[PDB]
Coordinates of C-alpha atoms and ligand atoms in Angstrom, one line a residue:
X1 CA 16.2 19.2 2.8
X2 CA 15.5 15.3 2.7
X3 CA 15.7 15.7 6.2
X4 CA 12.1 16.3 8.0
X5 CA 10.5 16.9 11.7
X6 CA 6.6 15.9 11.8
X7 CA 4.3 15.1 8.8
X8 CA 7.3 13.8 6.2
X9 CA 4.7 14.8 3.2
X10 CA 4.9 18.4 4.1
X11 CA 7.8 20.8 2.0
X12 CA 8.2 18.0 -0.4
X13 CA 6.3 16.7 -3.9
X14 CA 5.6 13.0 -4.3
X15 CA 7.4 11.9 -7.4
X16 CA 4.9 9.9 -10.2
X17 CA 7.0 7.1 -11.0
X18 CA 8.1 5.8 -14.5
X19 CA 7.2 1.8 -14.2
X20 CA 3.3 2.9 -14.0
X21 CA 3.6 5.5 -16.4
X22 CA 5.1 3.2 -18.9
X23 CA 2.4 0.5 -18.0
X24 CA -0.1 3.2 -18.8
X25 CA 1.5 4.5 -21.5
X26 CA 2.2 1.6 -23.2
X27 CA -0.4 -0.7 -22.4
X28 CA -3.3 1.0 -21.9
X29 CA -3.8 4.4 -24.0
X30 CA -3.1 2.0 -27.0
X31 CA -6.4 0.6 -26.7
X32 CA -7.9 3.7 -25.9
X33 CA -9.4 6.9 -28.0
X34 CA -10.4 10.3 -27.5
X35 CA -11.3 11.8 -24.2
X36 CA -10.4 8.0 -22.7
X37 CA -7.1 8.5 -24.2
X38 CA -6.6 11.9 -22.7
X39 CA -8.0 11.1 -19.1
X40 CA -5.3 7.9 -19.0
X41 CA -2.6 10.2 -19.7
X42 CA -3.5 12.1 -16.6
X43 CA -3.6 9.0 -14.3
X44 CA -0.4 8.1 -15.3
X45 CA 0.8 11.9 -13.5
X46 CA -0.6 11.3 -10.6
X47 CA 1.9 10.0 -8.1
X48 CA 1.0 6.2 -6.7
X49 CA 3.8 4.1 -4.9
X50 CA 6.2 1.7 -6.4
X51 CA 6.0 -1.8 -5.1
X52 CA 9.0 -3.4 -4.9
X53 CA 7.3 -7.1 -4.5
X54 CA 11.2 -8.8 -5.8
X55 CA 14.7 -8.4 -5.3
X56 CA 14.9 -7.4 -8.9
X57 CA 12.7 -4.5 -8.8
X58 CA 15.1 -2.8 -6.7
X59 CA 17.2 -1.8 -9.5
X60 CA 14.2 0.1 -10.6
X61 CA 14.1 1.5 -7.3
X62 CA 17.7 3.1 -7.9
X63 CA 16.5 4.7 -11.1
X64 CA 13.6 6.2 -9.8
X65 CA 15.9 7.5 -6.7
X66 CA 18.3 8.6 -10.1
X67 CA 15.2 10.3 -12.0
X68 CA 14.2 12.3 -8.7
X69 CA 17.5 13.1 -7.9
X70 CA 18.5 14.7 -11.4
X71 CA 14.8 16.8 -11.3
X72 CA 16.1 17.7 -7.7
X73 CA 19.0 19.5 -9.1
X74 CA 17.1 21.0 -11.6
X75 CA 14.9 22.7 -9.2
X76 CA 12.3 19.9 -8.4
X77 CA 11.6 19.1 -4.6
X78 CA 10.4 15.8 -5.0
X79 CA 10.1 12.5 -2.4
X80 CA 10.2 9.0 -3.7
X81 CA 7.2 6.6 -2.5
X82 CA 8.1 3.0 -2.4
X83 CA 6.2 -0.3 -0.9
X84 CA 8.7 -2.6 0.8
X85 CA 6.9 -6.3 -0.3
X86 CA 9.0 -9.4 -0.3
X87 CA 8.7 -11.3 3.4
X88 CA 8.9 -15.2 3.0
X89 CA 5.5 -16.8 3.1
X90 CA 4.2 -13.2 2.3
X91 CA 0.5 -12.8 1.8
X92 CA -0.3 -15.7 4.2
X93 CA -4.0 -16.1 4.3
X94 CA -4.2 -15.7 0.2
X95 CA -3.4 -17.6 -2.4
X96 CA -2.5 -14.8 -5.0
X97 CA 0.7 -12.9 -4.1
X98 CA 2.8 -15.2 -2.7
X99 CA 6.1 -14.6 -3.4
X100 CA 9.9 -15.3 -4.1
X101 CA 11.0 -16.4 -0.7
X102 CA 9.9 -18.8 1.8
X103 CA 10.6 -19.6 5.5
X104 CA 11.3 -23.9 4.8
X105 CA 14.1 -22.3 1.7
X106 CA 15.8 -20.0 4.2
X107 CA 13.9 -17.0 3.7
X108 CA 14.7 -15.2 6.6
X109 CA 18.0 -14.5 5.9
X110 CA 17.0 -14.0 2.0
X111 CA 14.5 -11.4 3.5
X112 CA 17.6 -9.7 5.6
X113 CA 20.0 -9.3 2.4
X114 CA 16.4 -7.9 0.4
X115 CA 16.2 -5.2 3.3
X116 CA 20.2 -4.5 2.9
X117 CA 19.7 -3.8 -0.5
X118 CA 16.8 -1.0 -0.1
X119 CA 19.3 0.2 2.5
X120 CA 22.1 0.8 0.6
X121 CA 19.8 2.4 -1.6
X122 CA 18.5 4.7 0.8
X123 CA 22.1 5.7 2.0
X124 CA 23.1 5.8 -1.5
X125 CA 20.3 8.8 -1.5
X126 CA 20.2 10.0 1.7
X127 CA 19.5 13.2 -0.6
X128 CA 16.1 12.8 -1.3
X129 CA 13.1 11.9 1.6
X130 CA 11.4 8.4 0.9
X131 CA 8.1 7.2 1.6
X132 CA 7.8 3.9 2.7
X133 CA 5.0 1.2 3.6
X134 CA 6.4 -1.3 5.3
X135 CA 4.9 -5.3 4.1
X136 CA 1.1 -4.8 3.5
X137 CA -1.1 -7.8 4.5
X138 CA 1.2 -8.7 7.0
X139 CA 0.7 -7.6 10.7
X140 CA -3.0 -7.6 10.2
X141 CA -3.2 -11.3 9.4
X142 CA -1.9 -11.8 12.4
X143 CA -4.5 -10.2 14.2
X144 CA -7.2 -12.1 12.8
X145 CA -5.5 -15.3 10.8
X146 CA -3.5 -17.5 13.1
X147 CA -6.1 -20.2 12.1
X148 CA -4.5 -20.3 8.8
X149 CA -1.4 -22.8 8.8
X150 CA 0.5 -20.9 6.9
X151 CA 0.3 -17.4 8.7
X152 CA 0.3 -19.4 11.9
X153 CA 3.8 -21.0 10.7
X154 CA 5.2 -17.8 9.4
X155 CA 4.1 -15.8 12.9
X156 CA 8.0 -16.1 14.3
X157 CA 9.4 -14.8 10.9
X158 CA 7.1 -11.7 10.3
X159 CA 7.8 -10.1 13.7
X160 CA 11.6 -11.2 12.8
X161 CA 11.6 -9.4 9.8
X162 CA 9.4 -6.3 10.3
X163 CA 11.7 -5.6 13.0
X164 CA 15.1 -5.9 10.9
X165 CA 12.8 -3.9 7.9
X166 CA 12.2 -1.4 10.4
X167 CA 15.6 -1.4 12.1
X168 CA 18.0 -1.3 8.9
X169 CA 15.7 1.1 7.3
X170 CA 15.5 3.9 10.2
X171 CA 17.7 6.5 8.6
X172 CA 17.3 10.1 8.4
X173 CA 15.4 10.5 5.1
X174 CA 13.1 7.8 5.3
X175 CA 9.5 7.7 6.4
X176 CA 7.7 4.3 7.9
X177 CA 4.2 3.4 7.8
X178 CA 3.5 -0.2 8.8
X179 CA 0.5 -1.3 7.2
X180 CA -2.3 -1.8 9.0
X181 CA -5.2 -3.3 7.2
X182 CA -8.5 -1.0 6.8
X183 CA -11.7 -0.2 8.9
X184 CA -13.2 -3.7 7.5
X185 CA -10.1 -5.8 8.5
X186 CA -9.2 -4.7 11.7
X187 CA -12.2 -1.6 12.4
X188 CA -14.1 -4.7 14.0
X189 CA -15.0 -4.2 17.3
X190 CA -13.0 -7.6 18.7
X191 CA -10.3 -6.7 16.5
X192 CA -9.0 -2.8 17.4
X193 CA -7.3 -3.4 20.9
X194 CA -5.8 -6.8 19.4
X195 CA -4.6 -4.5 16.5
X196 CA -3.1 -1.6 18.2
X197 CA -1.1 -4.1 20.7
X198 CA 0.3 -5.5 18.1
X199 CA 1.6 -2.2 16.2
X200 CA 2.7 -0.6 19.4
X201 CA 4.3 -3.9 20.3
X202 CA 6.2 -3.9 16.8
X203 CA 7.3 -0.1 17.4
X204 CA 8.1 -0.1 20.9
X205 CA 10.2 -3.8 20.3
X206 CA 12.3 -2.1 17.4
X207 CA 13.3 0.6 20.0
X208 CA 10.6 3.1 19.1
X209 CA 12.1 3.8 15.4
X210 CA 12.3 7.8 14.8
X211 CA 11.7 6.6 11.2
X212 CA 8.4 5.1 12.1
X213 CA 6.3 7.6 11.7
X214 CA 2.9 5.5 12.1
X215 CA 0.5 3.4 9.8
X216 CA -1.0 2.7 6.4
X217 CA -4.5 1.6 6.1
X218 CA -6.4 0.8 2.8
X219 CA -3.7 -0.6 1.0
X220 CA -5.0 -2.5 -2.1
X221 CA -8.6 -2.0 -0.4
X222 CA -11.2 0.0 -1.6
X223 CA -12.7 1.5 1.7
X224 CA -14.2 5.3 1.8
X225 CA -12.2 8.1 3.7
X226 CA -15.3 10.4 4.9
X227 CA -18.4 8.9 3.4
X228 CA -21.5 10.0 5.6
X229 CA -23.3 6.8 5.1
X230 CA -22.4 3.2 5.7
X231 CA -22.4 1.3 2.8
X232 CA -24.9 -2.3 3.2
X233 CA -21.8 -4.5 3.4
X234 CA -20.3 -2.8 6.0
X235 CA -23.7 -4.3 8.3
X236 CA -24.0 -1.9 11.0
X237 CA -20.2 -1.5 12.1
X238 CA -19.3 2.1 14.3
X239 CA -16.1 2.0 11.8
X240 CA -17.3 2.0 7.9
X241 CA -15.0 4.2 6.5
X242 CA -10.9 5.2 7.4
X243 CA -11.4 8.0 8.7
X244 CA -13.5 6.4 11.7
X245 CA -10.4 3.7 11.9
X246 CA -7.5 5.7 12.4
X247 CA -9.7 7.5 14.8
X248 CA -10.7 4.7 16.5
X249 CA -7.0 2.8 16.4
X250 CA -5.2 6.2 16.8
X251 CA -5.7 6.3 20.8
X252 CA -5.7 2.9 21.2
X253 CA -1.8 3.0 20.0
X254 CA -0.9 6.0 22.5
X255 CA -3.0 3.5 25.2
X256 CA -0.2 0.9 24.3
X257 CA 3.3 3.0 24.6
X258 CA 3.1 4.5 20.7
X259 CA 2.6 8.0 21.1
X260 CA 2.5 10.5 17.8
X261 CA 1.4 7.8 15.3
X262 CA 0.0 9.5 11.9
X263 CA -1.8 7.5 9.3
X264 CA -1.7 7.7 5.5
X265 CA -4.3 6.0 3.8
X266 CA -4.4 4.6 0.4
X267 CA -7.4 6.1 -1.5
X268 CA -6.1 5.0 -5.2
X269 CA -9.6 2.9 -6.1
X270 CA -11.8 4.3 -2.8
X271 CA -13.6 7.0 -5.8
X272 CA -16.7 5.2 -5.7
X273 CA -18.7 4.7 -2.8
X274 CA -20.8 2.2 -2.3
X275 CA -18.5 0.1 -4.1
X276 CA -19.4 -3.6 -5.9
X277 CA -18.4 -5.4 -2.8
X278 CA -21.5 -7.9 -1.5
X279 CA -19.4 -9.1 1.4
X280 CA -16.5 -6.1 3.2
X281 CA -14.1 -9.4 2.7
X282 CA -14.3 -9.5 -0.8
X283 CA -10.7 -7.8 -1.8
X284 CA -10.1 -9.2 -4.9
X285 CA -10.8 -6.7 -8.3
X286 CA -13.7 -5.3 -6.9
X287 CA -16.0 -4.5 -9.5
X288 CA -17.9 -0.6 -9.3
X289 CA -14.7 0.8 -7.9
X290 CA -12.9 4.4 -9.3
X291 CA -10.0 6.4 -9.0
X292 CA -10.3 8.1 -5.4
X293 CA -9.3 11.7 -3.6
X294 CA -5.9 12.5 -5.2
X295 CA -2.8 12.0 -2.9
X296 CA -2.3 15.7 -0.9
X297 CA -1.0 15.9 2.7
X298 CA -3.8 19.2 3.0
X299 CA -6.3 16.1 4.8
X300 CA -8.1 18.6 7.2
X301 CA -7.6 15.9 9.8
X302 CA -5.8 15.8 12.8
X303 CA -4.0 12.0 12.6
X304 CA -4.0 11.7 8.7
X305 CA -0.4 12.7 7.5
X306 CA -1.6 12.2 3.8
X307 CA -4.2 10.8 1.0
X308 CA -2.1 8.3 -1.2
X309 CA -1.9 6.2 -3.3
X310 CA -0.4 3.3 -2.7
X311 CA -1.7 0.1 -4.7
X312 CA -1.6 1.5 -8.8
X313 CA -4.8 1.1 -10.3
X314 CA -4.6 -1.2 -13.4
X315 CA -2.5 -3.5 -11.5
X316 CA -4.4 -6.9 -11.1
X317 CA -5.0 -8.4 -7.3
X318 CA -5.2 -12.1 -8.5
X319 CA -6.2 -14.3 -11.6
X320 CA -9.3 -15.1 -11.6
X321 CA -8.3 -18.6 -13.6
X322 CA -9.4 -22.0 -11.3
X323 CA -6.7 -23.6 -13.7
X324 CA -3.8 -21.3 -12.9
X325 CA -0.7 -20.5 -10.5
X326 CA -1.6 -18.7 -7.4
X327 CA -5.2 -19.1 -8.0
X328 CA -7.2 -17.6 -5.3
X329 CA -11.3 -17.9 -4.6
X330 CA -12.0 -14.7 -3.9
X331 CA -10.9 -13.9 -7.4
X332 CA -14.1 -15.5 -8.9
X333 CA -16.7 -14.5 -6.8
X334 CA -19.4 -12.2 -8.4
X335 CA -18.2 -8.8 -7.3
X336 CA -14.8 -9.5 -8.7
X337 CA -14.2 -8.7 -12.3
X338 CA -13.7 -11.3 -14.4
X339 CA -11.3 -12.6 -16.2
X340 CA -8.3 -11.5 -14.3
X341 CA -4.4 -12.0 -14.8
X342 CA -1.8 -12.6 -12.4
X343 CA -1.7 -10.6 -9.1
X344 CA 0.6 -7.7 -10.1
X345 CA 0.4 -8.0 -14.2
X346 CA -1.9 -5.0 -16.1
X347 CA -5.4 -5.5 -15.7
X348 CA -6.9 -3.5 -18.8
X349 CA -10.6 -3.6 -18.0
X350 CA -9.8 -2.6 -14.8
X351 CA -8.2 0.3 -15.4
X352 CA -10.9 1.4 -17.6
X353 CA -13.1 0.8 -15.0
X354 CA -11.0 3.1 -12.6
X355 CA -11.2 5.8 -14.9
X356 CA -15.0 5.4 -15.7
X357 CA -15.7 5.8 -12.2
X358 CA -13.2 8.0 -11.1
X359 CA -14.0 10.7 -8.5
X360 CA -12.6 13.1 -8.8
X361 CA -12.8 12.4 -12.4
X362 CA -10.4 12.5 -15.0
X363 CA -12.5 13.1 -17.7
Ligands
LIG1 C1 -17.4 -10.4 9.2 C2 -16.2 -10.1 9.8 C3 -16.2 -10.0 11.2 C4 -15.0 -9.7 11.9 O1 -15.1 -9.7 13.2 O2 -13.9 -9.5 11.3 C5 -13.9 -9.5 9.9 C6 -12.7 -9.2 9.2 C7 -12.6 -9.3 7.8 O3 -11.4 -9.0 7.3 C8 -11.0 -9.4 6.0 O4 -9.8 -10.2 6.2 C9 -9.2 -10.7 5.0 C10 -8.1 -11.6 5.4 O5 -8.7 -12.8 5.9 C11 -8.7 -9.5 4.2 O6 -8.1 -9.9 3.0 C12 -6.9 -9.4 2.6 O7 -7.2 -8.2 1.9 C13 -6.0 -7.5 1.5 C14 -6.4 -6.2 0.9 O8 -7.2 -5.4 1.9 C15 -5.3 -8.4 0.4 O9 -4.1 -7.7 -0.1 C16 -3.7 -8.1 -1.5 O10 -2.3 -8.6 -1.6 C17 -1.3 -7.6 -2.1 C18 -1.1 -6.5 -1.1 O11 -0.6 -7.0 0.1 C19 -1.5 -7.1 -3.5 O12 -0.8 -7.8 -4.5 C20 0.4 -7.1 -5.1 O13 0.1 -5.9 -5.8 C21 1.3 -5.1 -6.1 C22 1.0 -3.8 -6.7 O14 0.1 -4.0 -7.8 C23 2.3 -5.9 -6.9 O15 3.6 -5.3 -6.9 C24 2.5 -7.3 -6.4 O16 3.1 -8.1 -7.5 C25 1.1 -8.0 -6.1 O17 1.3 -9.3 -5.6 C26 -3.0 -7.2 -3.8 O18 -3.3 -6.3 -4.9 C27 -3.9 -7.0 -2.6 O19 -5.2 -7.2 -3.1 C28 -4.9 -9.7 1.0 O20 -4.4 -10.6 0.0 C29 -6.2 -10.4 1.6 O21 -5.9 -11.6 2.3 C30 -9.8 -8.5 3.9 O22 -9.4 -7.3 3.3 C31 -10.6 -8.1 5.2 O23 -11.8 -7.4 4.9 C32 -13.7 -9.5 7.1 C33 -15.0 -9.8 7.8 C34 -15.0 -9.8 9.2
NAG2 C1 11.4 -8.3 18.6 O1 12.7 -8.2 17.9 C2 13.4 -9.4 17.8 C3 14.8 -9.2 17.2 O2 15.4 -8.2 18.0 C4 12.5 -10.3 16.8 O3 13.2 -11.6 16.7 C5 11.1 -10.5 17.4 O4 10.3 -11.1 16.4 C6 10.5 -9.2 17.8 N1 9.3 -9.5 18.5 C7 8.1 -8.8 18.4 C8 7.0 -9.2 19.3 O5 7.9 -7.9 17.5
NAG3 C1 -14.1 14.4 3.1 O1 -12.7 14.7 2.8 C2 -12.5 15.5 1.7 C3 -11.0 15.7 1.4 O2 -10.4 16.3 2.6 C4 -13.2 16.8 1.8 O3 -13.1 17.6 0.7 C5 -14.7 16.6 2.2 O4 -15.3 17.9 2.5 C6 -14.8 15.7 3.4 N1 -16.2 15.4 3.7 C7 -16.7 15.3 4.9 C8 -18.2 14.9 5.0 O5 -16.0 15.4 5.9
MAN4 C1 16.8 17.5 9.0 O1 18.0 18.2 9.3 C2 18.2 19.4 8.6 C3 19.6 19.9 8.7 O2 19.9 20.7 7.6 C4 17.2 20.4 9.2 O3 17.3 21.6 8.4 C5 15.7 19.9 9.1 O4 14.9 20.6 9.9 C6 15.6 18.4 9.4 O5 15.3 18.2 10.8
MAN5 C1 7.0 19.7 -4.5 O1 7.6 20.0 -5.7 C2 6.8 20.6 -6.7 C3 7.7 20.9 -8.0 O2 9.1 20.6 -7.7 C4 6.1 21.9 -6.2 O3 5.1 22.2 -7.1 C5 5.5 21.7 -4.8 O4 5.3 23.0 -4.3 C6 6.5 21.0 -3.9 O5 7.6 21.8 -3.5
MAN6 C1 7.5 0.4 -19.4 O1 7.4 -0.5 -18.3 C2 6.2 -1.3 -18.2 C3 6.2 -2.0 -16.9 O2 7.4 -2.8 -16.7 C4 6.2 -2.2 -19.5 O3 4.9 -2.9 -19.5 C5 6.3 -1.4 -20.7 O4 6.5 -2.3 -21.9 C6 7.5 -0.4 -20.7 O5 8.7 -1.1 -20.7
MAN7 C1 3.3 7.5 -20.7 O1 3.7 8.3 -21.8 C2 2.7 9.2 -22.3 C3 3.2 9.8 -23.6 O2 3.7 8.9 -24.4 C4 2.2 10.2 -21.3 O3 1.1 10.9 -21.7 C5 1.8 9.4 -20.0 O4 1.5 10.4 -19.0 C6 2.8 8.5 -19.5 O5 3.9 9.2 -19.0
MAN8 C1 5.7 2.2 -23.0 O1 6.6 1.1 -23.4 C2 7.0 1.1 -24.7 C3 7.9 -0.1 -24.9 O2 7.1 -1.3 -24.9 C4 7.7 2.4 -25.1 O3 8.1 2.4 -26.5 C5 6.7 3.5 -24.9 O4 7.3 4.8 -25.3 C6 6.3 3.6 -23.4 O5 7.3 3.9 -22.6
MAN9 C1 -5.8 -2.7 -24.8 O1 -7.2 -3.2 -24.7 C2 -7.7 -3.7 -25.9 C3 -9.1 -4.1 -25.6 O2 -9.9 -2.9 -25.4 C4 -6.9 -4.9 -26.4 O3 -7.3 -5.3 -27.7 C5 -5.4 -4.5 -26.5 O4 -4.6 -5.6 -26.9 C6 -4.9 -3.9 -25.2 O5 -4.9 -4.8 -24.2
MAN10 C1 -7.9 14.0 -25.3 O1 -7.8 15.5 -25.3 C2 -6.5 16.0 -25.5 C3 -6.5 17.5 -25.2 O2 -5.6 17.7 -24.1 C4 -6.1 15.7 -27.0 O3 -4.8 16.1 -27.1 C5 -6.3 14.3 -27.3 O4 -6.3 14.1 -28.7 C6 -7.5 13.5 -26.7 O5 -8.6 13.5 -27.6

């Protein structure tokens, strides 16, 4: 049944998708031997979500839905895990993922027909469950980056859109998670109530969206689940890891009219703790990083729905090249690895890195 009361992760099988697979595949265990070789074939079956950061990816979207649908019938009981990506201005306090749309080139209403699309989609297969986070670095630069022009302009427009994502996409089958940022983002003391206003404010504005199941934290970040000591960067803070977070935030949403929030939390490059990080803010590549606890909704933990995956490991955060597009200046600092491609291409020497330092390891 795509159909689901409570945790949406339980009676189903996340589905590894074929776009990282390939990208694996293809352009990674060719430069690879031996045990390397083998371990990166392995990766590429563990399941991590599919971003769909254009309008053009959601054909992609449809085949995976397709592939899923067709192992369904075959016997499989699998759920499709998707990241919806594409608001105008998106990414506003970096310089590395902006994206296709933007709020001066009517983006809104470009954002609108983007969210029809994936809702047709989701009708279309109203068959299988699907796992959605809902517009990562969004919400939490609002929290804490209204002093940044562009966020500050593009304030109106998120809430405008994140409440028509979360609208159009409440259906029967589909599972929310707003993102949320992670215990070094919005964990700060001065920045939990702010945080959990906000949410609750989103949820209870949308008319409390059966749908919405809760939160995502640690997307594209790097932060520990459970680790027993705080890492140096972390200086001092009650909430170092996510666990501690979603803990902390958990009660805070209840406090604010969002009862029965679960989390997920993206542990896809979390493996190695401490990681290379010599500020928390540096979110760009981090170098000393690893593949993390593989994605299993058996958490032991009373608020977290599931471990996932969510940003693929492999795929780059920003160039590190002063000269390019989209250049960003977290991208060159020393703890991220250098030299980096665009935000979203294949990041070679990353990967490797990932695998290297993967716990649990792959090889
Ligand atoms: C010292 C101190 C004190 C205090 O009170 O509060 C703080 C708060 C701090 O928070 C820091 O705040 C910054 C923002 O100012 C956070 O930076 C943000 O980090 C996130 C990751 O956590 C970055 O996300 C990147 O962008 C997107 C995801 O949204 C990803 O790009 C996409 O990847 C997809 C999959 O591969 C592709 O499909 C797509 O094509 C591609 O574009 C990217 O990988 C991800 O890295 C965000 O950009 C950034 O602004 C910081 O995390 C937080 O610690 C610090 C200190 C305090
Ligand atoms: C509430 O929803 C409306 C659309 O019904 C939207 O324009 C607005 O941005 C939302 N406000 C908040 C605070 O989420
Ligand atoms: C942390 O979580 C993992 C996965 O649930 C578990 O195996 C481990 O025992 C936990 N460690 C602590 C200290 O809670
Ligand atoms: C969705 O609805 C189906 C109906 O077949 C139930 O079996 C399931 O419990 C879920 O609520
Ligand atoms: C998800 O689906 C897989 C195989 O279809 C099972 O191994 C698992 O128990 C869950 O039903
Ligand atoms: C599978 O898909 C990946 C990602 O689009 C490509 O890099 C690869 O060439 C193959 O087509
Ligand atoms: C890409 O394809 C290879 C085989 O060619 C697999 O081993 C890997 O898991 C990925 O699907
Ligand atoms: C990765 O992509 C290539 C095409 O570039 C395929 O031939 C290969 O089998 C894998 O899917
Ligand atoms: C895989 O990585 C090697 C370097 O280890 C490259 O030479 C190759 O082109 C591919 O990117
Ligand atoms: C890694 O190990 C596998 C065994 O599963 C081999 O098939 C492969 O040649 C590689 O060395």
């Amino acid at each position: 049944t795509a159909t689901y009361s409570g945790n949406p992760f339980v009676g189903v099988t996340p589905w590894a998708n074929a776009y990282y697979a390939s990208e694996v595949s293809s352009l990674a265990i060719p430069s690879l031997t031996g045990a390397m070789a083998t371990a990166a074939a392995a990766v590429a079956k563990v399941p991590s979500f599919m971003w769909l950061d254009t309008l053009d990816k959601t054909p992609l979207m449809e085949q995976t839905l397709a592939d899923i649908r067709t192992a369904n019938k075959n016997g499989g009981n699998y759920a499709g895990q998707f990241v919806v990506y594409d608001l105008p201005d998106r990414d506003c306090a970096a310089l590395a993922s902006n994206g296709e749309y933007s709020i001066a080139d009517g983006g809104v209403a470009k954002y609108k027909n983007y969210i029809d699309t994936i809702r047709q989609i989701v009708v279309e297969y109203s068959d299988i469950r699907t796992l959605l986070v809902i517009e990562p670095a969004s919400l939490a630069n609002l929290v804490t980056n209204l002093g940044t022009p562009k966020c500050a302009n593009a304030q109106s427009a998120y809430l405008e859109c994140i409440n028509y994502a979360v609208t159009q996409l409440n259906l029967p089958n589909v599972a929310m998670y707003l993102d949320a940022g992670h215990a070094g983002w919005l964990g700060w003391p001065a920045n939990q109530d702010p945080a959990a206003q906000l949410f609750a404010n989103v949820y209870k504005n949308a008319s409390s969206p059966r749908a919405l199941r809760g939160l995502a934290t640690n997307v594209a970040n790097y932060n520990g689940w459970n680790i027993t000591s705080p890492p140096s960067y972390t200086q001092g803070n009650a909430v170092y890891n996510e666990k501690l977070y979603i803990h902390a935030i958990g009660p805070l949403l209840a406090n604010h009219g969002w009862s029965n929030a679960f989390f997920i939390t993206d542990q896809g490059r979390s493996g190695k703790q401490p990681t290379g990080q010599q500020q928390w803010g540096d979110w760009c590549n981090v170098i000393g990083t690893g593949f993390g606890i593989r994605p299993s909704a058996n958490t032991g933990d009373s608020l977290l729905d599931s471990f996932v995956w969510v940003k693929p490991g492999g795929e780059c955060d920003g160039t590190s090249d002063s000269s390019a597009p989209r250049f960003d200046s977290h991208c060159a600092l020393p703890d991220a690895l250098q030299p980096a491609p665009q935000a979203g291409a294949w990041f070679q020497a990353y990967f490797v890195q990932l695998l290297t330092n993967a716990n649990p390891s792959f090889l």
